[PDB]
């Protein structure tokens, strides 16, 4: 209702429309290349700003601040693994995907192994992962932030948001979305820094957070419900390792071997094998512009511990009877969720610490985060479906019908998400951020295991790669089905899930499943006859500098990934510096 809020929300919309219009007036969207891969024309700053803005959603604000309040600062684990794995993207994987001349990541595996069946399998698994683990978190976290900050209807508001990100997606393609994401990253970081400032002022500095957080317990620890009674001191007092990234390897909530290995594995699928991030790396002007943007994204991916996790911990210090509630009656009154109220942490700092003018800015921040992520998913799924599935059904399709089918898939994936919104609203509290990271740790390691063997081990053949993926879905589905069967409960109400299934952290099962998919792929590969090198040029990390005539199991200016040695020198030295800073910060909080 404030003049200022409304003006700040429409200045944001004027920026987004302004840069959209400039981009469509510049770029060509009458071709598949242009509409789907920005004409292969993006420079370092669009690539990195896009990689950041395509990743950071409303779920980062709601999830990381929620978990920061709940469990302290080891969820920075999620964001900081990425520094190391975005170096992998540039220096190891994108070299190979730029010489392969692929538009989709299923197409790479078609070129590398050569069946009809791996490319179709990967497309259908990818599309379901985007429904379950990427769209669901954005709809859920949007609904938290609208319910708390605004108090609007969380059905109508999600429809209206999903509808305007539909129009923003179909209207210009990757080009528009990338150049716009350079605005949306500025808006996200700007408003997030302003809220960090107010929060750290309220608790009385950085020193204030680290001398007040461990004391931040609720004073309402006794229930009116029989067979609950006195809530345990384990589950309302803050965790006594709350200021340490590296937690105990058997009893930690995030064990350190699980953090470092298991997140490197699942992050490897997310950053290096996944169409949503890798389409930002197939639209670059040159490999040196891809490596430069990898570094911008990676320095930007430090920011989330200081802009979401610590704010959420400051939220538990300031509203301990509302953010750290444990009694069911109290949690039903505070946030409508019997199982806890961590999720209101960021939403509540915004609705209590921000003045008349800047509340509008923080609405612009969450809108920018949510719009950028949903648009990146709707475009990447458009490409995935159109290029892979629609060219199986109609081979002689051609670059006009394909754009029509690309824009009609965005409409379909919006309507499917609208239909899926009540299911995701059935997830109760901060359980959902454990569900999404668990489903990721059960489905993705088989895909990580194939792409590392498809890229680094040229002995691996099509039978190996396919039975690797299906053996993995089988092992993974074991954990998923028996878990979802007993639900989660809370610390107050432990589930009856037998411990051997549960008690192994899902990031540890990520590691076992990766090595089991790897071993199966290698074993079936080594029994069956190999793929010779005449089939493999410029599609394996060994052969990315080949010049020899490949024979397809399925112009030359994209094949060339030679960079200027001066500019190579510069991106190589900034990568080592960026790693050194990441390693220093992991040391500081370990």
């Amino acid at each position: 209702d404030n003049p200022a809020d409304i003006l700040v929300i429409a200045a944001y919309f004027l920026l987004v429309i302004g840069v959209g219009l400039w981009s469509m007036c510049r770029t060509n969207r009458g071709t598949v290349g242009g509409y789907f891969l920005a004409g292969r024309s993006m420079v370092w700053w669009p690539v990195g700003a896009s990689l950041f803005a395509s990743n950071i959603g409303s779920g980062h604000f709601v999830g990381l601040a929620g978990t920061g309040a709940a469990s302290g600062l080891a969820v920075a684990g999620f964001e900081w693994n990425a520094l190391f794995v975005v170096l992998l993207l540039g220096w190891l994987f994108a070299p190979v995907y730029l010489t392969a001349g692929v538009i989709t990541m299923p197409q790479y595996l078609r070129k590398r192994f050569g069946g009809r069946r791996i490319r179709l399998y990967l497309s259908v698994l990818s599309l379901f992962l985007y429904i379950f683990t990427k769209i669901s978190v954005d709809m859920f976290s949007g609904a938290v932030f609208i319910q708390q900050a605004l108090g609007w209807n969380i059905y109508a508001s999600v429809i209206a948001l999903l509808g305007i990100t539909m129009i923003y997606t179909v209207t210009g393609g990757l080009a528009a979305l990338m150049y716009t994401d350079t605005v949306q990253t500025f808006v996200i970081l700007g408003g997030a820094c302003i809220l960090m400032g107010y929060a750290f002022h309220e608790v009385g500095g950085y020193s204030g957070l680290f001398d007040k957080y461990l004391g931040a317990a609720t004073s309402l620890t006794v229930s009116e419900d029989p067979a609950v009674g006195n809530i345990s001191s384990f589950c309302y007092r803050p965790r006594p390792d709350s200021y340490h990234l590296l937690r105990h390897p058997v009893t930690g909530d995030l064990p350190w071997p699980a953090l470092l290995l298991g997140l490197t594995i699942v992050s490897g699928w997310y950053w290096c094998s996944d169409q949503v991030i890798v389409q930002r790396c197939l639209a670059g002007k040159s490999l040196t512009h891809i490596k430069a943007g990898c570094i911008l994204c990676g320095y930007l991916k430090l920011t989330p511990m200081f802009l979401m996790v610590m704010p959420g911990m400051i939220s538990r210090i300031l509203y301990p009877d509302e953010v750290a509630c444990v009694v069911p009656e109290v949690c039903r009154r505070v946030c409508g969720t019997e199982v806890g109220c961590s999720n209101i942490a960021y939403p509540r700092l915004v609705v209590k610490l921000m003045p008349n003018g800047l509340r509008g800015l923080m609405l612009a921040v969450m809108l920018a985060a949510l719009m950028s992520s949903l648009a990146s998913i709707f475009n990447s799924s458009s490409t995935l479906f159109t290029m892979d599935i629609y060219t199986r059904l109609r081979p002689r399709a051609g670059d006009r019908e394909l754009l029509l089918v690309g824009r009609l898939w965005v409409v379909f994936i919006v309507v499917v998400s609208v239909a899926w919104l009540p299911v995701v609203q059935a997830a109760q509290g901060g359980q959902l951020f454990d569900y999404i990271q668990a489903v990721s740790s059960y489905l993705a390691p088989p895909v990580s295991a194939v792409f590392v063997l498809a890229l680094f081990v040229p002995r691996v053949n099509e039978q190996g790669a396919f039975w690797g993926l299906i053996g993995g879905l089988l092992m993974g589905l074991a954990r998923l089905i028996p878990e979802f069967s007993f639900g989660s409960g809370s610390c107050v109400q432990p589930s009856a899930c037998p411990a051997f299934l549960c008690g192994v952290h899902y990031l540890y099962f990520a590691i076992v499943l990766f090595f089991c998919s790897g071993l199966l792929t290698l074993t079936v590969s080594l029994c069956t006859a190999p793929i010779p090198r005449k089939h493999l040029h410029r599609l394996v990390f060994s052969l990315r500098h080949s010049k020899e005539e490949r024979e397809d199991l399925d112009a030359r200016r994209l094949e060339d990934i030679s960079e200027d040695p001066s500019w190579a020198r510069v991106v190589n030295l900034n990568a080592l510096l960026m790693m050194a800073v990441a390693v220093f910060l992991w040391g500081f909080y370990a």
């Binding site: 790693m579 390693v583 220093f584 910060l585 040391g587 500081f588 909080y589």
Partner: peptide
């Protein structure tokens, strides 16, 4: 002290990147 933990982390990291330059210099050429 946190600052010492940070610097030991960086020190072991510069040791590992010196090992990477050693291994590829003697084993790729």
């Amino acid at each position: 002290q946190p600052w010492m933990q940070g610097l030991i982390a960086v020190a072991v990291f510069l040791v590992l990147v010196a090992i990477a330059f050693a291994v590829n210099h003697f084993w790729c050429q």
